[PDB]
């Protein structure tokens, strides 16, 4: 009986969930895993784009047999327009890849070499936008009452850690209210 969390998923568990994400790569080679879901494919041509699940790419990157392409959505100018959109939208939490947090943490571990000067550049941007998002959560969070909760757009990680608070409180509210009848 693990007991933890038990309601929340462990951070490493959600990391285990994001393992399932497919991603494009550039293998060094120029197989037939029978396990479960890949089913693909023939030996790939070197420096050519092919979509593969995350953890296998992590393996190949550990052996340096693949050249990971950087995700196109992650470009500093795009985060600038996001932050722009954020300063003008007190309510909407607009666009997030939703898994992007853990990605960036992992991409900067190894995939850092392929990107063009991410160092001291986007890292600050993601942090800045992250915290402004957190507080905008807090501003909408003061409004909390049954029965609606505005969940709109957020990365799953933060939703998971904030889960115990709101989940355990709202029940009390509903109970006392309905119970009063």
Partner 1 sequence: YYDIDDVLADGTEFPCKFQYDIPGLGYNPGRPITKNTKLSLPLWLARILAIVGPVPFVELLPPDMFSTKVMNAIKTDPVALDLHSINSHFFSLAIKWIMLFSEKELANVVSELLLQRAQELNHHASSTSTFLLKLEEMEKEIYKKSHESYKDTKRWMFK
Partner 2 sequence: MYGDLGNKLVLEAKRTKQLYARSNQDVNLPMYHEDIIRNILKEVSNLRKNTEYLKEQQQLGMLDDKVAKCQYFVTLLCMERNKRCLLAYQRLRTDILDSMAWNNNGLTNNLSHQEQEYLKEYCDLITDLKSGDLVDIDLSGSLVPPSDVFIDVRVLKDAGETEYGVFNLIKDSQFFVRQSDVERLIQQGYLQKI
Q: Which residues contact 100 (CB under 8 A, 6 or more apart)?
A: 74, 126, 155
Q: Name which of residues 10 to 39 contact partner 2 (CB under 8 A).
A: 12-13, 15-16
Q: Which residues contact 64 (CB under 8 A, 6 or more apart)?
A: 28
Q: What are phi and psi of 162, to 5 degrees?
A: -80, -15
Q: Does 154 bind partner 1 (CB under 8 A)?
A: no
Separation CA 108–CA 148 (nearest Å): 38
Interface pick for partner 1 out of 65, 89, 105, 112 (rule CB under 8 A): 105
Q: Does 3 bind partner 2 (CB under 8 A)?
A: yes
Stretch that binds partner 1, among 30-38, 73-81, 83-91, 171-179 (CB under 8 A): 171-179
Site string for partner 1, 10-49 (x = CB under 8 A): -xx--x----------------------------------
DSSP secondary structure letters along 74-138 = --HHHHHHHHHHHHT-SS------SSHHHHHHHHTTTGGGTSSS-TTTHHHHHHHHHHHHHHHHH
Q: What are phi and psi of 27, to 5 degrees?
A: -60, 155
Residue 157 interaction partner, one of partner 1, partner 2, none, beta carbon < 5-8 Å per kind: partner 1
Stretch that binds partner 2, among 1-9, 76-84, 123-131, 159-167 (CB under 8 A): 1-9
Interface pick for partner 1 out of 33, 62, 164, 171 (rule CB under 8 A): 164
Q: Does 56 bind partner 2 (CB under 8 A)?
A: no
Interface pick for partner 1 out of 145, 152, 153, 171 (rule CB under 8 A): 145
Select 52 or 157, whichever has its Cβ closest to partner 1: 157
Burial of 162 (0-12, 13-18, 19+ CB in 10 A): middle
Separation CA 153–CA 55 (nearest Å): 26
Positions in the binding site for partner 2 (CB under 8 A): 1-3, 12-13, 15-16, 55, 58-59, 62
The residues binding partner 1 (CB under 8 A) are 8, 11-12, 15, 105, 141-142, 144-145, 157, 161-162, 164-165, 168-169, 172-173, 175-177, 179-181
């Amino acid at each position: 009986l693990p007991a933890h969390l038990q309601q929340t998923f462990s951070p490493e568990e959600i990391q285990f969930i994001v393992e399932n994400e497919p991603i494009k790569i550039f293998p060094r080679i120029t197989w037939q895993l029978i396990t479960t879901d890949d089913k693909a494919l023939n030996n790939m041509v070197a420096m050519r784009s092919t979509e593969v699940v995350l953890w296998i790419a992590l393996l190949l990157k550990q052996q340096s047999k693949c050249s990971i392409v950087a995700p196109q959505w992650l470009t500093t100018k795009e985060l600038d327009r996001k932050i722009q959109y954020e300063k003008t939208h007190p309510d909407r939490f607009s666009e997030l890849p939703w898994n992007w947090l853990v990605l960036a943490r992992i991409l900067f571990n190894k995939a850092k070499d392929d990107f063009h000067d991410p160092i001291h550049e986007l890292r600050g941007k993601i942090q800045d936008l992250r915290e402004i998002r957190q507080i905008k959560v807090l501003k909408g969070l003061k409004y909390l009452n049954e029965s609606h909760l505005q969940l709109d757009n957020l990365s799953l990680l933060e939703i998971n850690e904030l889960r115990p608070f709101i989940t355990e409180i709202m029940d009390k509210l509903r109970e006392i209210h309905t119970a009063s009848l």
